[PDB]
């Protein structure tokens, strides 16, 4: 449990991943933590941009279900044999649990170059598992077989590794209070966004623009992804508050010298969320360090920077641009997502996010979700 502290490697750019031991004798793989899907899938054959894969023929305990699954996504896909084997987690657990696994033998645009993970642990709900919700997820297997609570928490520590805590909340990963918001639906970790504000001022938008058709906490998405219309109204407000075009679309990076200190000039971005006691809301904030994102890291007198927010067609995705700011509690048992100020989320001593509350839920619907 406190053994789970610092169990993830990686960053907010290339993803955070967990070591996992699979089969008998154990094969050691690097599995991305992804709260936006629900399958457990690993490389099953050598690939160009991976070092190692799970060989099912060297596992004495592997058994095949005799069918295979394909998962499609916007750019790319992955097909895999569905089977079952024993897994252990070196950081957290003394024993082993019998889980479903998809061994990928064919994919398009799945394993990309300079990526250190060779598989993916979907930690969302049964409903988004392929090929059907009746394929037990890893987290429902572990919860059941290890007698832990139906809660996990995650802390990302690469703004400017991480801890993934399976079966509770570890106090030394946060400071202050945990504020919780309701899970609105159990497929993605869907929550209700009430209000966005840039630099102390609100965007002229209905609260339902934000949750179109869903605001989700996704560890398997790099950026804060906003529906096109929200995206456009955020950009217009950020530009107005300071310095800046292709920079907004992710097709160019703006370079500034050290002393032109870029961060001083952009505004805070605050996301208002409904408290469990509905008359109230709280506010999670990120500052410029998380969303104006240094890309070179060479420690020269300049840096070039990506805008870590991007348009989505129909999804508001609270990915790593925001999650890096907080400790995040996926409390499935109580149907709620917690957020707390994260100690590791400060660049040169300064905190790069904030959390605050409570505020009143007047001036916004009883309910902001379709």
């Amino acid at each position: 449990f406190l053994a789970m502290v610092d169990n993830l490697q990686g960053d907010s750019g290339r993803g955070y991943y967990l070591e996992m031991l699979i089969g008998t004798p154990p094969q050691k793989l690097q599995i991305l933590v992804d709260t936006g899907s629900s399958n457990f899938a690993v490389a099953g054959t050598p690939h160009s941009y991976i070092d190692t894969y799970f060989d099912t023929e060297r596992s004495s305990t592997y058994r095949s279900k005799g069918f295979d699954v394909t998962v499609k996504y916007t750019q790319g896909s992955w097909t895999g044999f569905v089977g079952e084997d024993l897994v252990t987690i070196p950081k957290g657990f003394n024993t082993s649990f019998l889980v479903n696994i998809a061994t990928i033998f064919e994919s398009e645009n799945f394993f990309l170059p300079g990526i250190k993970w060779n598989g993916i642990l979907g930690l969302a709900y049964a409903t988004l598992a392929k090929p059907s919700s009746s394929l037990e997820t890893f987290f429902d297997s572990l919860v059941t077989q290890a007698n832990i609570p139906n809660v996990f928490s995650m802390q990302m520590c690469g703004a400017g590794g991480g801890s993934l805590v399976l079966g509770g909340i570890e106090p030394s990963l946060y400071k202050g209070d945990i504020w919780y918001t309701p899970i609105k639906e159990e497929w993605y970790y869907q929550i209700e966004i009430l209000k966005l504000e840039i630099g102390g001022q609100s965007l002229n938008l209905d609260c339902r623009e934000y949750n179109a058709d869903k605001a989700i906490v996704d560890s398997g998405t790099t950026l804060l992804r906003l529906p096109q219309k929200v995206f456009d109204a955020v950009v217009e407000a950020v530009a107005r508050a300071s310095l800046i075009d292709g920079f907004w679309t992710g097709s160019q990076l703006a370079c500034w010298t050290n002393s032109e200190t870029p961060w001083s000039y952009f505004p805070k971005i605050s996301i208002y969320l409904r408290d469990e006691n509905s008359s109230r809301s709280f506010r999670i904030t990120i500052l410029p360090q998380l969303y104006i994102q240094p890309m070179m890291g060479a420690g020269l007198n300049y840096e070039c920077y990506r805008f870590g927010i991007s348009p989505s067609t129909n999804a508001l995705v609270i990915g790593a641009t925001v999650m890096e700011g907080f400790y995040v509690i996926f409390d499935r048992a109580q149907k709620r997502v917690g957020f707390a100020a994260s100690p590791c989320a400060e660049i040169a001593g300064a905190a790069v996010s904030e959390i605050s509350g409570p505020f009143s839920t007047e001036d916004v619907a009883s309910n902001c979700v379709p």
Partner: nanobody
Amino acid sequence: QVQLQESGGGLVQPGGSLRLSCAASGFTFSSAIMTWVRQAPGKGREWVSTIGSDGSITTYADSVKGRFTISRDNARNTLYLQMNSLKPEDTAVYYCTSAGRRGPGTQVTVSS
């Protein structure tokens, strides 16, 4: 869509013996992992035993090892738990579970 109904529970004396069944309908049982968990009155949810889809891989809780045997008959959509050498501490509701879903339970009660 996981529907399940356990039965076979009842009242037995220590050293007694029961066979619990769990019947499934509506999902692909012969391709699912299946597990038994029990739950005493105001004690914790306690995992009992898990069986892989074809039956060859079974794992067990220390507390029931050598006493209980999990097994399934895929052709009849049914899971089993052979419960021997029953002692009062085994008293509880036994639930079969798969993919986040469970049956109503079967009451197993061991007393002298």
